[PDB]
Design a protein around this ligand. Structure first.
Ligand SMILES: O=C(Nc1cccc(S(=O)(=O)NCCc2c[nH]c3ccccc23)c1)Nc1nccs1
Ligand SMILES: O=C(Nc1cccc(S(=O)(=O)NCCc2c[nH]c3ccccc23)c1)Nc1nccs1
Lengths: 836, 267, 195, 169
């Protein structure tokens, strides 16, 4: 909301004459009490010959691209200057604003007698933008006839010593979107008497002598007040005086005709939007009713709106007059020949206007004030103020007829309920001991009726303050007017906390551990790539395709939430590779979204109580499963190239090692088992188990998936479900025997298909407690042992707890281990050795 | 060519089995290490008290007799000193020693900071005990000190009980029964109810506590009529021994990698 | 000669900032809370005093879960986590919650649709704006140096009353200390306490 | 903490070092007579009469734990320690008793601090045997000087500072 300081100063000055403050101080005071000041614009300065001119002659220059005009301009004292201008929104006889040779326009432009388009141009005719007077639009500024004589000083006529304040009013302060409301706020801040510009001393009521039009109101539309008054026989050719067109321009409104201009002016002045109907274009009774399915209205701008059965209209016998609270319609629109005007002063339902305007994308000046509740007490006063002013400008009478529907039964008293609040409650909440009588003085300034009953005030807020409705609301009024800067900084004592949880501590350890091992964390996106599961070649019934779906995504082809973190990880990989960073390991710890049934929403639960355990359980059950995952991808070189050697490309074993890093970080033991599971390679994919619970997969990606996806050849990947990895808090007590160890190496021949870990387990199982360590050295194949067999060489370290192991005692333990491998995996001993 | 794509795929799927691997092979070419289990216990203790608003203090291990004894209300000729328990710095009558507990660190903190003071201090400490299964001459201690207005034994017990829950489970609590230390009055010995194990819950002697003696408050410029203080201390090797069931403290101090590795990395 | 054959990685700087923030509040006795990113409208709006027909919702700022009128959405801030914590725990409650949050902003140099938020909630007997400012000032010292503090000036949010916007005095740099708009705060609205 | 997590992930095992030096360790190292590391603070009643000197370096204790691991058959080992040393400046100067009926003055505290040896915090490590173990990938890689240089770079990355290495004797 833009408005100019002069107008705001004028309204404040009625009850505190002589009031005046710098823009700086005004900006600061506005911020301190709660109003965001987006910009402070003083009206761009001019120097020198910038005066009113009158266009005495126009000559259309032909032969150029656009239409150009050589103009004779009367600039004062019977001097006529020739001026080139490219606009077209002016005729002979029009007052304009000329910047003449020697003048300096805002932006540091000096005007000079140039030659242009074949003629001499002694300056230029100005636009409201070029003078930093108002918004840039097509064409130059034209002053209304009789605003000033040719030769008058531009800066004084235009009022360029004024400053416009651009504010962002918060939706709880609708009353502040007008000179009325902001002026009241300043009188509160500055401790001034305030004369309300909507009151009767300042708007004397016009007569009330019978209805002004037939009106039926379906009251379930939420209309709270609906008033009409007519002004007849107005000059359709009159224009608004300069002072009024100016104030509208500084407020962001382009003036058009007195019928419209006067309703925009009173809207800005008092905060009650208004509308002017061409009365002679209404047919019959005015009806306020809901719209029907499929109904249409054409609004002032000539655009057909598709309506909705929750939209409130004004209709007559013939057509639609208004989308009530949002925008008038074409059928009763004031237009060039309109002589008899019916003025609408309505109070619509805030939620109704909100829904309708969002749905139609019509955030009009009217709608935005109704959304935030307009003061119903001032409808007739805004009506009367508006009628007098229209008659005064365009010269008709104000008919003494008046409709004033005020509900059924009529509501005569618009005040909210009273609020009971303890007198020191603002003191407690602020942590300040305010001077005595402070809370009651400040609530008085904002227009509430305050009465004392010991320690308990009763506060009845004014009608323009529907936001003031609990004691909390009243505290904010006291605290903001006293200033928030007076509130001290006092650390609270917080109780002994329990610190971070196991799961939180585990996710940090997983991240530190992966980052040290060379992985770079990304923030994954939860919006899947389009068709990623078709690229992976997933079956139609694969659980990962059952995705939750967003309904208004920022990319229309990426609306599915992720059931897996790999898509986002692979996306960041592709980005790194495409920028020349080809040796990359990335990881993510984030939640997935895995829905169980269909999207089942739970109905609204009353918020005047807490939900019951059953209601919470039902809300939880309605949401998708959202477990925490950890995932990683690797491509390129795992070990970089350097003096040591050429480096080592990523292989599936590096993803297996990433499982082991995560598991070590989680203090749990894993087992890897061969598995087939897209998007992994079928012979290089492992399913990960903690105990007997599957927790995810790891390995190399399927080369077909890599190819269809544009991934680096050989990309590996790992994904684990962190919710499936149980907590462990081990309390180890390692036996550390100091007696000498015995080292023996044993080679076993097994079927190629037997996993190496199976052979190690079998050797450990049979060897017993004497086996301190087992480790795989060699995996050898060759013809002499069998085309489908392989030799595994294990390094065994034996150690006794109480004695030095004899070497025969160790060989007994080996024999037992070899026999166990025979019985379990069919192993055949090939040879043993005393590791030297 | 339905059957063309069929076997042109079947041979393509066997190219994938041809290039299979034993996914159970070892992958760890950078074997993991281990932060020391005492250090990790200290870390867990420190995190427990930080999370209650307290702060960690540290100080030298070679310390002045002023701070290790005289400020702690423990004079020259009191029954006992370092004829029998303290390592003394040469030469004889230099008033330097290896600290025997971390209280001098608490004493330094009281000189250096404004009140109130809530302070944990964890550090290496030195006693002339021969190394055996239940004693080490080089050990690690935790101590606490709360100095504020209005502190009581009730607060001492609440802190001790929070500490026990952190290190021993939600079923744990403490009992105190009177003892004597020169720097506290009343003094008490602290027993912890070790529910989670021990092979059947029992009380275990944990450490000692008490209200800070007024002579200690005067020797640090604090008016004992306005401020009171409590304090406690527990030995970390002791705590680890009976919590984890570690029969031989030599394993804690000797540096065998086999003792640390099973405790994990500590990251 | 180079020796680093296992190049180092990096935890994400947002994650590390969250980590530093979380450690700051833990060290003051507070606790961390977490919750789902797909959340019920009950907890993300209705319990927060922010009803259906209030001026604004997710015609313009919220990702909604299909289908239309399922009362599910991607959370737009972490307050529903604070709301869950108030249902689930005994009072007093001192709670930080840090998490991924979702707004329909196009990604440019100063906006991201997927962002990470920190929120605090203290509910106790006798808490005031004075305590709000002390917490905010401690937080600012932790993340911005011992010279930092905050100012508050009135604003509006549906879940607080009074409401304020928080500016942080960023002394250490910015190329010459200035106030910077940090976030928002307020006293919890009574309708939120009843819900 | 970060230095310890970082070294432990890279495969080092932390020990609690002993502050009592081995007998004649600096003669075994061949240190000159005036080498600052020989100016040790001395305990007066040690539990071993030939180990009364406090450590000016953490390597003696680290090497002692290494020798123990190797002598028990654990031959591929990387150990580290974070602990303070004791480096005295003048002779053992004790400060006289200050009355404990008052707090010591800032000057008296400064004088007590100055009377104690310098006691800075060190980080140290030792490595022997195989750095990378033997396995299907290959025979493994024995420890070399570059692995100690890499240990500097781990500590420095953990400390968020940049280092330079320069040849030295
Ligand atoms: O009071 C503090 N700590 C504290 C209090 C009670 C118990 C413990 S203890 O559990 O560590 N047991 C120690 C036992 C002990 C060591 N040497 C002795 C000599 C003779 C007799 C007994 C002992 C520590 N600290 C303070 N800092 C500043 C002001 S008070
Ligand atoms: O009050 C709580 N947090 C809190 C309070 C004040 C500011 C902030 S903020 O700085 O995040 N700004 C948010 C702004 C905003 C988001 N959506 C809007 C829609 C309309 C208008 C404004 C917004 C967070 N949490 C609670 N938990 C339980 C009970 S109250």
């Amino acid at each position: 909301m833009r408005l100019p300081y002069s107008w705001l100063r004028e309204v404040v000055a009625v009850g505190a004459s002589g009031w005046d403050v710098t823009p700086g101080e005004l900006e600061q005071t506005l911020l301190r009490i709660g109003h965001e000041v987006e910009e402070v614009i003083p009206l761009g300065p001019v120097d020198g010959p910038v005066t009113v001119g009158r266009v005495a002659d126009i000559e259309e220059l032909t032969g150029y691209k656009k239409p150009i005009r050589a103009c004779a301009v009367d600039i004062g004292d019977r001097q006529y200057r020739e001026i080139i201008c490219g606009a077209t929104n002016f005729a002979v006889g029009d007052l304009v604003v000329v910047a003449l040779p020697g003048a300096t326009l805002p932006g540091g432009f000096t005007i000079s007698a140039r030659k242009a388009y074949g003629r001499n141009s002694d300056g230029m005719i100005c636009s409201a933008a070029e003078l930093n007077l108002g918004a840039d639009h097509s064409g130059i500024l034209v002053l209304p006839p009789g605003a000033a004589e040719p030769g008058a000083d531009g800066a004084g006529v235009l009022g360029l010593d004024d400053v416009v304040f651009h504010l962002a009013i918060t939706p709880d302060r609708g009353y502040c979107m007008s000179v009325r409301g902001l002026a009241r706020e300043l009188a509160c801040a500055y401790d001034l008497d305030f004369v309300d510009p909507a009151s009767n001393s300042r708007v004397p009521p016009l007569p009330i002598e019978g209805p002004a039009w037939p009106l039926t109101v379906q009251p379930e539309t939420g209309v709270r007040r609906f008033a009409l008054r007519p002004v007849i026989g107005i000059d359709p050719a009159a224009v608004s005086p300069w002072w009024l067109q100016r104030r509208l321009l500084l407020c962001g409104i382009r003036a058009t005709c007195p019928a419209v201009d006067v309703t925009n002016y009173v809207m800005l002045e008092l905060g009650h939007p208004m509308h002017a109907h061409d009365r002679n274009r209404i047919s019959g009774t005015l009806g306020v009713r809901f719209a029907r399915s499929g109904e249409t209205a054409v609004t002032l701008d000539g655009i057909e709106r598709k309506l909705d059965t929750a939209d409130v209209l004004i209709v007559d016998d013939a057509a639609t007059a208004a989308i009530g609270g949002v925008m008038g319609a074409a059928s009763t629109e004031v237009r060039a020949d309109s002589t008899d005007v019916l003025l609408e002063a309505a109070i619509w339902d805030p939620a109704a206007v909100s829904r309708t305007q969002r749905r139609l994308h019509l955030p009009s000046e009217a709608a935005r004030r109704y959304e935030r509740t307009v003061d119903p007490a001032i409808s007739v006063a805004a009506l009367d103020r508006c009628a007098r002013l229209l008659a005064d400008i365009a010269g008709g009478e104000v008919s003494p007829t008046l409709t004033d529907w005020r509900g059924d039964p009529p509501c005569d008293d618009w005040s909210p309920p009273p609020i009971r609040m303890g007198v020191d409650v603002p003191d407690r909440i602020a942590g300040v001991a305010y001077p005595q009588g402070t809370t009651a003085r400040r609530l008085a300034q904002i227009g509430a009726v305050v009465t004392h009953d010991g320690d308990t005030l009763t506060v009845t807020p004014p009608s323009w303050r529907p936001d003031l409705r609990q004691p909390a609301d009243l505290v904010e009024e006291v605290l903001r007017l006293e200033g928030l800067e007076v509130i001290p900084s006092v650390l609270p004592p917080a109780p002994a906390g329990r610190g971070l949880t196991a799961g939180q501590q585990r996710r940090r350890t997983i991240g530190r551990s992966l980052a040290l091992s060379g992985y770079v964390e990304i923030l994954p996106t939860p919006f899947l790539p389009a068709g990623v599961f078709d690229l992976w070649g997933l079956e139609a019934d694969d659980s990962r395709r059952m995705t939750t779906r967003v309904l208004n995504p920022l990319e229309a082809d990426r609306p599915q939430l992720a059931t897996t973190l790999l898509p986002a990880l692979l996306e960041a990989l592709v980005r790194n590779v495409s920028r020349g960073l080809v040796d990359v390991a990335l990881f993510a710890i984030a939640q997935v979204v895995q829905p169980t049934e269909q999207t089942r929403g739970v109905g609204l639960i009353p918020v005047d109580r807490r939900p019951t355990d059953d209601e919470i359980a039902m809300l939880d059950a309605s949401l998708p499963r959202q477990p925490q995952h950890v995932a990683a991808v690797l491509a390129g070189l795992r070990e970089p190239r350097g003096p040591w050697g050429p480096g080592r490309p990523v292989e599936a074993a590096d993803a297996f090692e990433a499982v082991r890093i995560i598991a070590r970080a989680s203090r749990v033991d894993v087992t890897l088992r061969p598995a087939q599971y897209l998007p992994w390679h079928p012979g290089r994919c492992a399913q990960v188990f903690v105990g007997e619970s599957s927790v995810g997969h790891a390995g190399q990606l399927h080369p077909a998936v890599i190819e269809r996806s544009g991934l680096p050849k050989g990309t590996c990947a790992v994904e684990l479900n962190l919710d499936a990895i149980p907590c462990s808090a081990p309390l180890p007590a390692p036996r550390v025997s100091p007696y000498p160890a015995v080292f023996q190496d044993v080679s076993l021949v097994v079927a190629a298909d037997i996993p190496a870990q199976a052979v190690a387990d079998a050797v450990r199982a049979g060897a017993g407690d004497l086996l301190e360590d087992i480790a795989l050295f060699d995996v050898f194949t060759g013809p002499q042992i069998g085309e489908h067999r392989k030799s595994l060489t294990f390094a065994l370290r034996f150690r006794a707890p109480d004695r030095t192991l004899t070497e025969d005692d160790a060989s007994a333990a080996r024999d037992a281990a070899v026999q166990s491998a025979a019985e379990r995996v069919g192993a055949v001993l090939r040879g043993w050795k005393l590791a030297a | 060519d339905e059957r063309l794509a069929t076997l042109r795929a079947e041979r393509d799927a066997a190219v994938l089995v041809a290039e299979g691997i034993d996914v159970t092979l070892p992958s760890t070419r950078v074997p993991a290490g281990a932060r020391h289990p005492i250090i990790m216990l200290a870390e867990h203790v420190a995190d427990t008290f930080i999370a209650m608003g307290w702060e960690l203090a540290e100080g030298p291990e070679v310390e002045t007799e002023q701070f290790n004894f005289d400020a702690l209300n423990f004079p020259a000729d009191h029954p006992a000193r370092g004829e029998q328990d303290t390592f003394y710095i040469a030469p004889e009558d230099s008033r330097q020693l290896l600290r025997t507990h971390t209280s001098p660190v608490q004493i330094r903190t009281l000189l250096a900071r404004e009140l109130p003071v809530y302070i944990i201090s964890i550090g290496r400490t030195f006693r002339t005990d021969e190394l055996d299964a239940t004693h080490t001459p080089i050990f690690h201690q935790v101590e606490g000190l709360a100095v504020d207005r209005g502190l009581s034994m009730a607060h001492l017990r609440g802190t001790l009980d929070a500490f026990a829950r952190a290190e021993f489970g939600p079923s744990a609590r403490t009992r105190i029964r009177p003892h004597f230390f020169p720097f506290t009055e009343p003094s008490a010995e602290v027993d912890v109810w070790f529910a989670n194990k021990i092979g059947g819950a029992a009380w275990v002697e944990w450490g000692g506590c008490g209200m800070v003696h007024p002579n200690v408050l005067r020797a640090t410029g604090i008016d004992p009529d306005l401020y009171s203080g409590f304090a406690f201390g527990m030995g970390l090797e002791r705590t680890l021994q009976f919590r984890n069931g570690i029969p031989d403290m030599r394993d804690m101090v000797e540096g065998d990698v086999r003792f640390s590795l099973p405790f994990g990395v500590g990251a």
